[PDB]
Write an enzyme that holds these catalytic residues in place. Structure first.
Site, PDB file in Angstrom:
ATOM      1  N   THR A 192       0.812  -1.239   0.000  1.00 22.43           N
ATOM      2  CA  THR A 192       0.000   0.000   0.000  1.00 22.43           C
ATOM      3  C   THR A 192       0.838   1.279   0.000  1.00 22.43           C
ATOM      4  OG1 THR A 192      -1.554  -1.258   1.305  1.00 22.43           O
ATOM      5  CG2 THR A 192      -1.986   1.038   1.019  1.00 22.43           C
ATOM      6  N   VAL A 226     -10.840  -7.694  -0.758  1.00 23.77           N
ATOM      7  CA  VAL A 226     -10.654  -6.278  -0.949  1.00 23.77           C
ATOM      8  C   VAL A 226     -10.499  -5.537   0.376  1.00 23.77           C
ATOM      9  CG1 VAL A 226     -11.552  -4.138  -1.885  1.00 23.77           C
ATOM     10  CG2 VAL A 226     -12.038  -6.306  -3.070  1.00 23.77           C
ATOM     11  N   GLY A 227      -9.425  -4.749   0.467  1.00 25.01           N
ATOM     12  CA  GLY A 227      -9.179  -3.924   1.631  1.00 25.01           C
ATOM     13  C   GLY A 227      -9.715  -2.499   1.517  1.00 25.01           C
ATOM     14  N   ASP A 228      -9.176  -1.621   2.342  1.00 24.29           N
ATOM     15  CA  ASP A 228      -9.694  -0.256   2.381  1.00 24.29           C
ATOM     16  C   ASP A 228      -9.208   0.618   1.224  1.00 24.29           C
ATOM     17  OD1 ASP A 228      -7.101  -0.430   4.065  1.00 24.29           O
ATOM     18  OD2 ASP A 228      -7.185   1.659   3.575  1.00 24.29           O
ATOM     19  N   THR A 234      -3.038   3.363   5.173  1.00 27.33           N
ATOM     20  CA  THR A 234      -2.327   2.117   5.024  1.00 27.33           C
ATOM     21  C   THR A 234      -2.377   1.384   6.326  1.00 27.33           C
ATOM     22  OG1 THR A 234      -0.119   1.225   5.074  1.00 27.33           O
ATOM     23  CG2 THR A 234      -0.298   3.466   5.569  1.00 27.33           C
ATOM     24  N   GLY A 235      -2.813   0.140   6.300  1.00 25.80           N
ATOM     25  CA  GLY A 235      -2.837  -0.649   7.507  1.00 25.80           C
ATOM     26  C   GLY A 235      -3.756  -1.843   7.415  1.00 25.80           C
ATOM     27  N   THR A 236      -4.320  -2.251   8.555  1.00 26.26           N
ATOM     28  CA  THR A 236      -5.196  -3.425   8.604  1.00 26.26           C
ATOM     29  C   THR A 236      -6.515  -3.071   7.917  1.00 26.26           C
ATOM     30  OG1 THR A 236      -5.690  -2.731  10.859  1.00 26.26           O
ATOM     31  CG2 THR A 236      -4.105  -4.396  10.648  1.00 26.26           C
ATOM     32  N   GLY A 237      -6.607  -3.435   6.648  1.00 24.13           N
ATOM     33  CA  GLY A 237      -7.690  -2.980   5.806  1.00 24.13           C
ATOM     34  C   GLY A 237      -9.059  -3.146   6.399  1.00 24.13           C
TER      35      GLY A 237
END
Ligand SMILES: [Ca+2]
Ligand SMILES: [Ca+2]
Ligand SMILES: [Ca+2]
Ligand SMILES: [Cl-]
Ligand SMILES: [Cl-]
Ligand SMILES: [Cl-]
Ligand SMILES: [Cl-]
Ligand code: NA
Ligand code: NA
Lengths: 158, 134, 135, 157
Positions: free
Chosen positions: C1, C30-32, C52-55
């Site tokens: 990311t 799919v993440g954030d 950016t991180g734990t989606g």
């Protein structure tokens, strides 16, 4: 506290002059039966999660509504379905987009929330995951209705 | 597009939204229905919301979360929030549609700026109400 | 990311976010990052944000829009909203990560609750600053 | 004209003990070059949209960062890429998810925003759309790097 349910079957250019009374009656009947199912569940102390999941499952199963059975057609003459569910108690959520081989998207979404560490899954990956978790694969044409296909034909005509 | 929102006897909120998309849709397009905060949102501290309308605008305006944020951070009542989003903010972005919403106190609303919205609501232990037109 | 946010000389804000996802990811997840309000958001009235991180947590908490909302409706400053979301709300839901944000007045913030975040920032006509670890 | 840019290349458990100075310098040098590029565009009056779009394209191009070239691998040893771009002036946005044959997802996202009525496209659909707009198909292998592949094998074991 007070317990309550609301449901919708889509907003838009619904108008008295293109609708027949029998058609309106069928919609009233379906909305009435589904909202009541929800009320009785709530009344018997079922979770809000179970209630919205089941209400949406019933809207999917009804061919009058553009979800699940009765889904509209894309320009390719296919069905692409999407759904989401969210639990206000845990703030957990589940969602699928672009699936064509799952009967009930809402159940698939809840499957994502409860049987994976993810929130959103798309397409074939979503389908594959759902099958792995035991959800049935259906042929893509189970959702098709003549009424929605006629709408596609009319949209193309204009 | 279909949806449901509910508040249960334990005080929990939940929301769900499901759709077949749009007639003649470009394959691969995703509207608001499956996007958390756009077409579906729920939080015990504020509201539960399911949306239906022109997807693009509901995504750009984070319609469903916006209801929550306006109540939670803005102080607006459920009704005030629904008015702002559905009658003022979405039309200014070119969007049409509506949403259904229940807050944590049990108020319920079904705003829409279109000719109609297939809908229904009812409190547990009471008679339900259905509607198609305005 | 990866991502970027900016405020131009005309006073416009914008945000962009792009990712390869996660190592060993379930195909289809799919993440954030591609979801408006979660991993990417920009509004001239408030802020531009890229996360950016734990989606999963960023989606559940609508992190990017939440910054905007806490500021726009809640009256929090950019720094206060960033602290709320990144150091309090996200961790409470089991989320790790960070974000970059520029508000309409040219304030910039780069919070993260992890050990590090590859980042950089610079004002037009000034020397840039880079970073990997915590200050 | 308090113009300014910020970029990121990912948050996480980056630790001094588990890294070498030279690895660090490479990352510092890449971040700096990209941010400076952005800064200079801003100084020249380029738009925020153009600036973040280019910044992210460079981050995609750089193999050190997990976006575009240098993308991590899925469970199935493929690359699934996502991106979004939002213009705070118009509140318009474009996004793609699950694309594996487009070199620069942020450019595809920008295409969705500017050359369609939509906000988000996924998968094959998003790709065909991009192709119709003139974006070229690439092999999914162009994103592959031994570094990320090694991380995948290490994650499996
Ligand atoms: Ca149950
Ligand atoms: Ca889970
Ligand atoms: Ca009564
Ligand atoms: Cl009749
Ligand atoms: Cl808060
Ligand atoms: Cl960490
Ligand atoms: Cl040295
Ligand atoms: Na149906
Ligand atoms: Na890269």
């Amino acid at each position: 506290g007070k317990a309550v349910i609301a449901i919708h079957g889509g907003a838009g250019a619904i108008s008295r002059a293109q609708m027949s009374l029998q058609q309106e009656l069928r919609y009233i009947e379906a909305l009435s039966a589904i909202v009541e199912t929800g009320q009785k569940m709530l009344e018997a102390g079922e979770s809000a999660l179970d209630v919205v999941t089941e209400a949406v499952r019933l809207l999917e199963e009804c061919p009058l509504f553009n979800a699940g059975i009765g889904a509209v057609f894309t320009r390719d003459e296919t069905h692409e379905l999407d759904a989401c569910v969210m639990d206000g108690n845990t703030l957990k959520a589940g969602a699928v987009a672009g699936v064509s081989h799952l009967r009930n998207p809402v159940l698939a979404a809840r499957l994502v929330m409860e049987q994976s560490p993810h929130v959103m899954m798309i397409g074939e990956g979503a389908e594959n995951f759902a099958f792995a978790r035991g959800m049935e694969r259906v042929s893509p044409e189970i959702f098709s209705t003549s009424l929605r296909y006629e709408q596609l034909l009319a949209a193309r005509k204009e | 597009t279909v949806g449901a929102v509910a508040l249960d006897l334990d005080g929990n909120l939940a929301a769900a939204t499901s759709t077949g998309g749009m007639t003649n849709k470009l394959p691969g397009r995703v509207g608001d229905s499956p996007l958390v905060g756009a077409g579906c949102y729920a939080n015990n501290a504020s509201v539960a919301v399911s949306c239906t309308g022109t997807g693009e605008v509901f995504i750009r305006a984070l319609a469903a979360y916006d209801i929550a944020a306006l109540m939670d951070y803005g102080g607006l009542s459920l009704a005030e929030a629904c008015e702002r989003v559905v009658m003022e903010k979405l039309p200014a972005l070119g969007g049409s549609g509506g949403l259904i919403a229940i807050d944590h106190e049990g108020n319920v609303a079904l705003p829409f700026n279109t000719e109609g919205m297939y809908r229904a609501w009812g409190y547990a232990g009471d008679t339900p109400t259905t509607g198609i037109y305005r």
